[PDB]
C-alpha cells in the first residue's frame, strides 16, 4: 500500500459545495430518496502494487464500493445485481473514469480535478452535468 | 436545410496539421496503409427540420459515410455487417459523438470543437488521444 504518488490518491470527504446532482441522478433512472442529496460521501484512493484502489463510502446511506483498477484497463464491478464496466485513466493529469452500465444503456464520465487540498468532481451522463467538491481528510 | 445556428455546423476540410492518428489507427486495431495517413476528408454538418446530417467524405478512398442524428438520441450505422452505436451530444458549444463498436468492444469519443473558421476534431480511445484540424471550404 501507497497513499502518494498522484495528486488525485487520499481521502477526500463532501462539502457543501455541489451543483445539478439531483438532475444527474435522476438522469441515471435511480431514485432520489436512496441515491441523491448531499450526504457526506467518502473518496479514498491508494495504490497497491500495479493497481490501484478507490473506496466509494456514504455512511449515511451505510454503502460502500470497493473498486480495483489498474490505468487504462477495463474494469468490471456490480451495483446490487446490475454490472458496471469502467475504465479509469489520466488526461490533461486529471485522473477520468469511463462508467458504462449496459443493462441500462447509461454511459457516464467522471474526471476528478485537483487544487491544492481541494478536489472538484464533474459527473457526465447525456447532457447532463453535475459537480461535487471535496476537501482533504 | 439549415447550414447556420452551430458553431460546429459547416463543410469542413481537412488541413495539414494532424496529430498522434496513426497512434490512435492503430490503438483501434486497423490497417495504417489503409487508414493512417492524412488524406483529404471532408466534414459537411447541417440541420433538416427535426435531425442532423453529418457527411464524412474521404474522396482518395471512395468512403461517404451519411451519418443522421438528432442530439441526445442514439443512432446506428454499419461497419462490415456488424452494428455501430453512435450518440451526438452538446458540450456547451462543441459537439461530441460517444461511439461503441460492439464487435470490438471498443468505446470511441469524437469532440468537433471550432475555434475558428477553424475546426479541431479529437479522437479518443482508452488512453490514446489524436487530433485533427479542419478549414472551413
Ligand atoms: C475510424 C475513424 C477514421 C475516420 C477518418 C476520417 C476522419 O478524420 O473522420
Ligand atoms: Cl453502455
Ligand atoms: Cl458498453
Ligand atoms: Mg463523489
Ligand atoms: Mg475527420
Ligand atoms: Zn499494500
Ligand atoms: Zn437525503
Ligand atoms: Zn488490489
Ligand atoms: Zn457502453
Ligand atoms: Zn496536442
Ligand atoms: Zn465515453
Same mark, same amino acid.
Given at each position: 500500500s501507497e +497513499?502518494? !504518488? &498522484?495528486? +488525485?490518491? !487520499? &481521502?477526500?470527504?463532501?462539502?457543501?459545495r455541489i451543483e445539478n446532482?439531483?438532475?444527474?441522478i435522476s438522469a441515471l433512472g435511480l431514485p432520489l430518496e436512496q441515491y441523491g442529496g448531499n450526504h457526506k460521501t467518502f473518496h479514498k484512493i491508494?495504490?497497491?502494487?500495479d493497481h490501484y484502489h478507490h473506496q466509494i463510502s456514504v455512511p449515511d446511506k451505510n454503502y460502500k464500493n470497493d473498486v480495483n483498477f489498474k490505468l487504462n484497463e477495463?474494469?468490471?464491478?456490480?451495483?446490487?445485481?446490475?454490472?458496471?464496466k469502467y475504465k479509469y485513466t489520466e488526461d490533461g493529469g486529471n485522473l477520468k473514469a469511463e462508467v458504462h452500465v449496459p443493462s441500462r444503456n447509461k454511459v457516464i464520465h467522471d474526471?476528478?480535478?485537483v487544487n491544492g487540498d481541494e478536489l472538484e468532481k464533474?459527473?457526465?451522463?447525456?447532457?447532463?452535468?453535475?459537480?461535487?467538491?471535496?476537501?482533504?481528510?
Open positions: +497513499w502518494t !504518488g &498522484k495528486s +488525485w490518491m !487520499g &481521502k477526500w470527504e463532501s462539502t457543501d446532482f439531483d438532475a444527474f491508494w495504490k497497491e502494487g477495463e474494469g468490471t464491478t456490480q451495483h446490487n445485481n446490475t454490472e458496471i474526471e476528478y480535478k464533474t459527473y457526465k451522463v447525456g447532457d447532463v452535468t453535475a459537480k461535487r467538491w471535496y476537501k482533504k481528510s
